[PDB]
Structures are given as structure tokens and as C-alpha cells.
Ligand binder design. Structure first.
Ligand code: A1IEZ
Ligand code: CL
Length: 309
């Protein structure tokens, strides 16, 4: 239509290599390498636990291009349920720096605490992920990699969406991103994304549906044992992930609506906030979980208390 673009006045913060003490590697995979460490901003009397991400690519130019694309997207994002970029470090391979999420990724968390996770926790996570995704939709950001492995656990009551490696900014009243044939996790992708490389907020809703399924199955692998090359044909025949045992029809119906062929028929993130919030008020009416009732979960400053103008 006629709507233009406003200036992006986000501040990119450059942090000195020498203000960081890497304690340990947290993990390595397709995301690159993530380290744990401690940030001590020279001027203040403050110590801030951080995570540090480097990419692992064929050459340094490619790695630096892709990591600065991810810094660009994240610099502009400020929500309690989305990872906040604290800054970058201009080592040879550029690094991103964020607040340390000490419990790690929600996929491993639910697998590790499977016998201790009640309905209140599971519905509250679904609410928080939908809030984060609704925020990204309002910023015209399509994440394109929403999965339980890309949700981090600050505390059992507080999760954040991470990994902006595939994220794209839509122009004002632009509806779609058309991709150019890089690797994309097929078992979390909308059917139009597999067939036509079209990505929308409504394709992120499909991924949200698979993420909820991963949580409600305590971290099962979707389409377990099925090769990626068969998923397209399975979806086109009308097959979907099965109803998790703990799920009432109310919860499974939400997941199924996320996996409808008509992208505009799928729920909006703003509707998923309302639905999961309603269910979180009476959690044992919506999820039927064995032993639900009887299971619990220096100058060091939390980065959410260290605010940068
Ligand atoms: C070892 O983690 C495996 C999942 C991996 C998958 N993909 C990620 O992107 C990521 C992962 N862990 C963490 C992470 C964060 C905060 N605390 C702990 C952690 F592990 C991630 N974010 C991250 C890390 C460092 C800097 C920035 Cl700007 C980050 O946000 C994009
Ligand atoms: Cl994967």
C-alpha cells in the first residue's frame, strides 16, 4: 500500500573483549558455539552473568555477515519473553552477548524434569511464548525457527525466545518473506514454507503449534524416525502430530488449528495469549497429568536490572 518506513534508532553497543571472563563452553551445534561468562562493565561496581555466541561457518566473512544480521534484528527487540542483545564484541569472529539463562533450553529442561512438570508450568510457558511471538509480530519480525530448543529458561516461571539466525523483517504492510533455498528445520515448518518457501507470522504460528506439542509430550521428537524428505507428502495427505496423552480436546484443538492448510485460518498469537491465559486459570481442567499436585520446581546484578540508555 502507501505506508513508508520509519528510522530504526536502536543503539548497537560494542563491548570490550577485556570486560569478559568466559567460564566454560555451554554447547556447540548447528547454532555455532555458546559460552557462559561474567561481564564487568569497567565504570560500574556491577557483575553480570552472560552467554556469548559465535557462528561456525566455512569462512570468517560468511560467519561475520550472518552474526551481524542476527545482531541487527535483536538490537531492535525489548520484551520480557525475547532474548535481549546486550552488545557485540569485535573479535576476529564477531560475538553476540546476552543475559545468561541459567536453566538452558526448554526442550532439555522438560526432558530432564519430566516427572516434576505440572499443568500450571506447561500452560504458563505456552502463554509466555505466545506473548514473545506477538511482540515480534508487532515489530514485523518473522522468527522462522521457533522450536522448544530455541526457548530458554531464566527460571521455571520465566522463558525467552532465542536464536534470530533465520529471522526476517517485513516491510510496512508486506505480508510474506520468500526464502532462497538455505537449510531450514522441516519438522517445525508450515506446509506453504516447505512447498513455496513463503514465510509469514502465520507460518510462525504453525511452528508454535509444534513447539506446544514438544512441551505437552515432555520433549518428544516430532514425526520420530520419519526422514525430513517424507514430511511434505505426510502433511499434504492431511496427517498431523498425534494428540499428546495429557491433552484434553481443548488443548489438542488449538494445536490442530495451528496446522491448518489455510494460513489465515490459523490462530493469531494475540488469540493464543487469551486462550492459554484462560486455561492457566484452571490448569487441571485442560491437562490431565499424573502427580500434578505434588511436584515443585557479590555485587552480581541481573541484566534485567542493568538498564542501558
Ligand atoms: C547452549 O545453548 C544451546 C541452545 C543455543 C541455540 N541458539 C541460540 O541462539 C542460543 C543457544 N543458547 C543460548 C543461550 C542464551 C543465554 N543463556 C544460555 C544460552 F545457552 C542462545 N542464545 C544466545 C547466546 C549468546 C548470545 C545471544 Cl545474543 C543469544 O541469543 C541469540
Ligand atoms: Cl533439529
Amino acid at each position: 500500500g502507501s505506508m513508508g518506513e520509519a528510522p530504526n534508532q536502536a543503539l548497537l553497543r560494542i563491548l570490550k573483549e577485556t570486560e569478559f571472563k568466559k567460564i566454560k563452553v555451554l554447547g556447540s551445534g548447528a547454532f555455532g558455539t555458546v559460552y557462559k561468562g561474567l561481564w564487568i562493565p569497567e565504570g560500574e561496581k556491577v557483575k553480570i552473568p552472560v552467554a556469548i555466541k559465535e557462528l561456525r561457518e566455512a569462512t570468517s566473512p560468511k560467519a561475520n555477515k550472518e552474526i551481524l544480521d542476527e545482531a541487527y534484528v535483536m538490537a531492535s527487540v525489548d520484551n520480557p519473553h525475547v532474548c535481549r542483545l546486550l552488545g557485540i564484541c569485535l573479535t576476529s569472529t564477531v560475538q553476540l552477548i546476552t543475559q545468561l539463562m541459567p536453566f538452558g533450553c526448554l526442550l532439555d529442561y522438560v526432558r530432564e524434569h519430566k516427572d516434576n512438570i505440572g499443568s500450571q508450568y506447561l500452560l504458563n510457558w505456552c502463554v509466555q511464548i505466545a506473548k514473545g511471538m506477538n511482540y515480534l509480530e508487532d515489530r514485523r519480525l518473522v522468527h522462522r525457527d521457533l522450536a522448544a530448543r530455541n526457548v530458554l529458561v531464566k527460571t521455571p516461571q520465566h522463558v525467552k525466545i532465542t536464536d534470530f539466525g533465520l529471522a526476517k523483517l517485513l516491510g510496512a504492510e508486506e505480508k510474506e518473506y520468500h526464502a532462497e533455498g538455505g537449510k531450514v528445520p522441516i519438522k517445525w515448518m508450515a506446509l506453504e514454507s516447505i512447498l513455496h518457501r513463503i514465510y509469514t507470522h502465520q507460518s510462525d504460528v504453525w511452528s508454535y503449534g509444534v513447539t506446544v506439542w514438544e512441551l505437552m509430550t515432555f520433549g518428544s521428537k516430532p514425526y520420530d524416525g520419519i526422514p525430513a524428505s517424507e514430511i511434505s507428502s505426510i502433511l499434504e495427505k492431511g496427517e498431523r502430530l498425534p494428540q499428546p496423552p495429557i491433552c484434553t480436546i481443548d488443548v489438542y484443538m488449538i494445536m490442530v488449528k495451528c496446522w491448518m492448510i489455510d494460513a489465515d485460518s490459523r490462530p493469531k498469537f494475540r488469540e493464543l495469549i487469551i486462550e492459554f491465559s484462560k486455561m492457566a486459570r484452571d490448569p487441571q481442567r485442560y491437562l490431565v497429568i499424573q502427580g500434578d499436585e505434588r511436584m515443585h520446581l557479590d555485587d552480581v546484578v541481573d541484566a534485567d536490572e542493568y538498564l542501558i540508555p
